[PDB]
Amino acid sequence: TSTVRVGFDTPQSLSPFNALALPDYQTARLSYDTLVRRDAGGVVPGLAASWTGDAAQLTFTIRDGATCSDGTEITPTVVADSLSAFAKNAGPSTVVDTFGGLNPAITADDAAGTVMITPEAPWADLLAALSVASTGIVCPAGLANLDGLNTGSVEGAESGPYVLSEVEPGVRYTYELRDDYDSWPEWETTLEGEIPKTIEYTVVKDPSASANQILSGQLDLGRIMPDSRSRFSDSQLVSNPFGNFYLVFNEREGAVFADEKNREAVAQVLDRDAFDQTTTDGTGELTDTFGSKATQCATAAPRPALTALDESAAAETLAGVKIRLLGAQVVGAAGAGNTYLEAALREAGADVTLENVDIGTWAGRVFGQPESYDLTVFPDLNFTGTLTSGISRFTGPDLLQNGGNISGAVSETANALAQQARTATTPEQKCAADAEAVAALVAEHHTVPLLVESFIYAKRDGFSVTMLGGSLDDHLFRIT
């Protein structure tokens, strides 16, 4: 057999530029190629053979024999056109995350074979950001039709190994391997087995449905909730550390969590052990910061001072307070963590409405309609492997003003600390700024850092799956 059938969530977009949720990145990974790719000890050559520079400026030398699905030579102008189109068309949040601002300098040179990126101020995260599927290269046929990229394949747009051949919206996305592609990344790791010719990315509505369809052979790979583990042999399971979870409040003037006393009361109600039990059942790990111990600066001083549980004080504060609680269904099986949080808030006398929605709908709400909810457990994908990703959700200009500040938080201290992380002379001054920024954001009740989850793949005999270098959107499927 040459086909793999993979369980996944419904995409909200098949355009790299509009990618916000994991399924969007999963599809973008098959159809488009990024300049660099994740492997152990950092980043590996992909569509760029090598690069030079630092936080203030990077120069990528593009690789030879790189082709689009029509035949266009992938040249410096093709890449710079793609990366410019990304900078202009992607969500403000993911652009400032990639470039430290909305107006990077991007300039090709077909003679030199170079693509030069000059962020409007130094941005360390730029290199790691260009490993992320959403920065995958869109060939000229794709730039001609951006509305087309959203719903599936526009002939010749693909820089990547697969073309989406059949689409059944919200059901199945059938990918076929292109015969004219040997532009694989320069992996240091050796993978056992063969690149699948077909990938059937198959929407599962539910974790129970995921498990059943591995067990009955309707699926070859698929995500399992921790409760389903015992249905499988240890050999059928591949567990990786994945999303890092933390609270995000709507802190805008007139909203209930504009008032810090209300945010503190939520912190006083959220038992982090109980939240971990409901969400991961002990397959995950608690974290006081925006990442795991593998995250750059995540062990540097200072550690945040978390608000202690105080259910009595919280009951006085939240009596009849109206809370629009938005929940992603990845936060525990069918959003069980969001259910726990609603119940802890209701127990404190709050008038809580929970909307538990699929990851695609959740992402559209958080990034498109920020004023439409009060509180969410944010399941972050820390692509860049730094604390910067998380700090950006709470600092700088509001998302409403084309910034990355999802919450609309105004922390003077954290804003200034985000600025000194950028001016930092050394890695150590950078970690001290990042660490102090997280401590400040926790001390002022802008967030509660919760946990790092485990992504558990359950698989059938003859199928492997690998995640290299702590990567999140680069699931390496193989037939064995």
Ligand X SMILES: NNC(=O)c1ccc(O)cc1
**Least distance from ligand X to the Cβ atom of residue 54, Å:** 29
**Least gap, CB of 24 to ligand X (angstroms):** 8
| Residue 363 lies near ligand X (rule: CB under 6 A) | yes
Taking the least distance from each CB to ligand X, the nearer of 183 and 338 is 338
User: Rule CB under 6 A: is residue 22 a binding residue for ligand X?
Assistant: yes
CA of residue 351 relative to chain centroid, distance: 31
Q: Per rule CB under 6 A, is residue 222 in the interface with ligand X?
A: no
Q: Which is nearer to ligand X, 6 or 154 (CB)?
A: 6
Cβ closest to ligand X, residue 358 vs residue 436: 358
Q: Does 330 bind ligand X (CB under 6 A)?
A: yes
Among residue numbers 427 through 466, which ones bind ligand X (CB under 6 A)? 453, 455
Which CB atom, from 45 or from 379, has the smaller least distance to ligand X?
Answer: 379
Report how many residues bind ligand X under the rule CB under 6 A. Answer: 11
Q: Which of 381, 416, 443, 476 binds ligand X (CB under 6 A)?
A: 381
CB of 349 to ligand X, least distance (A): 31
**Residue 331 beta carbon to ligand X: minimum distance, rounded to whole angstroms:** 8
Does position 21 bind ligand X by CB under 6 A? yes
Closer CB to ligand X, 141 or 363, in the complex: 363
Least gap, CB of 13 to ligand X (angstroms): 12
> Considering the rule CB under 6 A, would residue 379 count as an interface residue with ligand X?
yes
Nearest residue to ligand X, using CB? 243
Chain positions 224 to 253 lying near ligand X, rule: CB under 6 A, are 242-243
Query: Which CB sits closer to ligand X, 201 or 242?
Result: 242
Q: Pick between residue 51 and residue 394 the one whose CB is nearest to ligand X.
A: 394
Per the CB < 8 A criterion, the answer to whether 80 and 115 are in contact is yes
Q: Which is nearer to ligand X, 246 or 455 (CB)?
A: 455
Residue 306 CB, nearest distance to ligand X (Å)?
A: 22
- Considering the complex, what minimum distance in angstroms separates the CB of residue 380 from ligand X? 7
C-alpha 228, offset from chain centre: 24
Q: Which is nearer to ligand X, 236 or 382 (CB)?
A: 382
Chain residues binding ligand X by CB under 6 A are: 21-22, 242-243, 330, 359, 363, 379, 381, 453, 455
